[PDB]
Amino acid sequence: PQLHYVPYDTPVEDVMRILKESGTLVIRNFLDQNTVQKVQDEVDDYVRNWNPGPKYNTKQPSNLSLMSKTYRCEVLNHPWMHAICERMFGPTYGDYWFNGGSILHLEPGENTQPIHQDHVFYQISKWRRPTDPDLTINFTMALTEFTVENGGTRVCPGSHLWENGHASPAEEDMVPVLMQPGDALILPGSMWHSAGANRTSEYRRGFATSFHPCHFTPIESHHHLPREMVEEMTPLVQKMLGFRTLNLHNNVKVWKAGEGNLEDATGL
Amino acid sequence: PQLHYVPYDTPVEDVMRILKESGTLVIRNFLDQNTVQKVQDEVDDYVRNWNPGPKYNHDIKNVGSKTKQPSNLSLMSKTYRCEVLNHPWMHAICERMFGPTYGDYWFNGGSILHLEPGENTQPIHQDHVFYQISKWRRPTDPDLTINFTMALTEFTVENGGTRVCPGSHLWENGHASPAEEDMVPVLMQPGDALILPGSMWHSAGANRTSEYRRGFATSFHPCHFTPIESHHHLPREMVEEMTPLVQKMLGFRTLNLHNNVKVWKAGEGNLEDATGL
Ligand SMILES: CC1(C)C(=O)C=C[C@@]2(C)[C@H]1CC[C@@]13C[C@@]4(C)C=C5C(=O)OC[C@]51[C@@](C)(C[C@@H]23)C4=O
Ligand SMILES: O=C(O)CCC(=O)C(=O)O
Ligand SMILES: [Fe+2]
């Protein structure tokens, strides 16, 4: 197992094989630079933080899908995300949906993040085998370059196959993920990973998406979003963000409105 | 293991011990006659116009041709959402079932359980079969869900009263279905409640009487599992009239896992702070 970097046109079956063998990979040019920049600009325009000028004469961050039209209209429809999620969660769990998504702004001077698996906050990971499907998957998209010096994510290829209770990987066995703007690192919930120290004078920036099986409760709820935004989402994204009924592998539906579909009861 | 009939004032510790040992029990006088009638009055028109059988096709064919199982009880019954979902027995048992391992719990689903005269016996099943992760679970682990089946009409053998198999919750996930001769019918007057952890093998019986047999149910499961029923379609003034507890139960508040980790959150803060709840 190694850290693989693959082009955008890599066949899906290759990507899933690499995920199975090494537990992680990078898809180069996952997004164009303009798209990842657009999410940042829309986030900045939402929070409207005051930035002083040279001399004298605001909202708190919320869901990325609420702050960024590009995130909810373009990013969450990314075909690579759904191609992988369909194959990772589909055969066992049926539908999947959005787990959580955050802006990554690694501050200069931040030290090394502890090495961890993402599925630790699922109590059922204590029951899961390494051969089972993953409990969640994360897509980390680079806005700025990911370098060794600015604290880019580090992975340990193959550590997703380790048994439960296995010791953390050694610091020297971590592999830095070197990414250009628009690249994306695929992080299944079983991959041990950590952010490095930002020993530069500039921010390391990016954002994440994550998805997990329909029968698990997402980190984030989007129920507070204005109806106008929901109605402009694709049906796929409406399902991703908790506005539609989900189908289990046994065809039983969850997140229903009574015995019917949520979207029929809300008038979507 | 045995099927026990206990009074309402049974200490919580005895109820938990019976659930651990025998996998089920009946709590008599769980609701009073006033609550039984108020629920029956609020759901009368609803169940009558409801069409029997399952509404959609799925792999669990345990809804017979003469069975009506309508849900959406919080939308259709004020007493369900303002009082029943606040029931102290449900929350006391749920906190001790899911708390130490999962943290918060919330509402899973809740159906009317109405047997028309002539309905045949339901297939014997565990309620948590529709969780893929029950295959991963071991019998000594906490349950994935728990059900409270409350009698609205009397529950008798001949009217299709629920049947359980005490001690079948401790079977391994590969164990075959209990034999029909192994099932124990339960006896309930209106307002009695049968407690059904998701691992207990149970089924409704055949309604060989001239009167329908009706119950209704609540069910709760850990905060990290997706409820079978959403409630985001309910009107806001309904939500504002709920207690904050029932508000959490029905998915209008952020949930706390077992390690200061929150799920069902609005970006950074809580969902309730984002909607002005
Ligand atoms: C298909 C059926 C008949 C079954 O064979 C086994 C489990 C489920 C899927 C029911 C229908 C709906 C549920 C969904 C719910 C959350 C609330 C309902 C209920 O109140 O009674 C049936 C349920 C149950 C107790 C069992 C569960 C439950 O877990
Ligand atoms: O109606 C009953 O008594 C039992 C119904 C049931 O077990 C079920 O629907 O899963
Ligand atoms: Fe059941």
TrEMBL record, chain B:
<feature type="binding site">
    <location>
        <position position="127"/>
    </location>
    <ligand>
        <name>Fe(2+) 2</name>
    </ligand>
</feature>
<dbReference type="InterPro" id="IPR008775">
    <property type="entry name" value="Phytyl_CoA_dOase-like"/>
</dbReference>
<dbReference type="GO" id="GO:0046872">
    <property type="term" value="F:metal ion binding"/>
</dbReference>
<feature type="binding site">
    <location>
        <position position="125"/>
    </location>
    <ligand>
        <name>Fe(2+) 1</name>
    </ligand>
</feature>
<keyword id="KW-0223">Dioxygenase</keyword>
<comment type="similarity">
    <text>Belongs to the PhyH family.</text>
</comment>
<feature type="binding site">
    <location>
        <position position="69"/>
    </location>
    <ligand>
        <name>2-oxoglutarate</name>
    </ligand>
</feature>
<dbReference type="GO" id="GO:0051213">
    <property type="term" value="F:dioxygenase activity"/>
</dbReference>
<keyword id="KW-0408">Iron</keyword>
<feature type="binding site">
    <location>
        <position position="202"/>
    </location>
    <ligand>
        <name>Fe(2+) 1</name>
    </ligand>
</feature>
<protein>
    <submittedName>
        <fullName>2-oxoglutarate/Fe(II)-dependent dioxygenase SptF</fullName>
    </submittedName>
</protein>
<dbReference type="Pfam" id="PF05721">
    <property type="entry name" value="PhyH"/>
</dbReference>
<feature type="binding site">
    <location>
        <position position="127"/>
    </location>
    <ligand>
        <name>Fe(2+) 1</name>
    </ligand>
</feature>
<feature type="binding site">
    <location>
        <position position="202"/>
    </location>
    <ligand>
        <name>Fe(2+) 2</name>
    </ligand>
</feature>
<keyword id="KW-0479">Metal-binding</keyword>
<keyword id="KW-0560">Oxidoreductase</keyword>
<feature type="binding site">
    <location>
        <position position="162"/>
    </location>
    <ligand>
        <name>2-oxoglutarate</name>
    </ligand>
</feature>
<feature type="binding site">
    <location>
        <position position="122"/>
    </location>
    <ligand>
        <name>2-oxoglutarate</name>
    </ligand>
</feature>
<feature type="binding site">
    <location>
        <position position="213"/>
    </location>
    <ligand>
        <name>2-oxoglutarate</name>
    </ligand>
</feature>
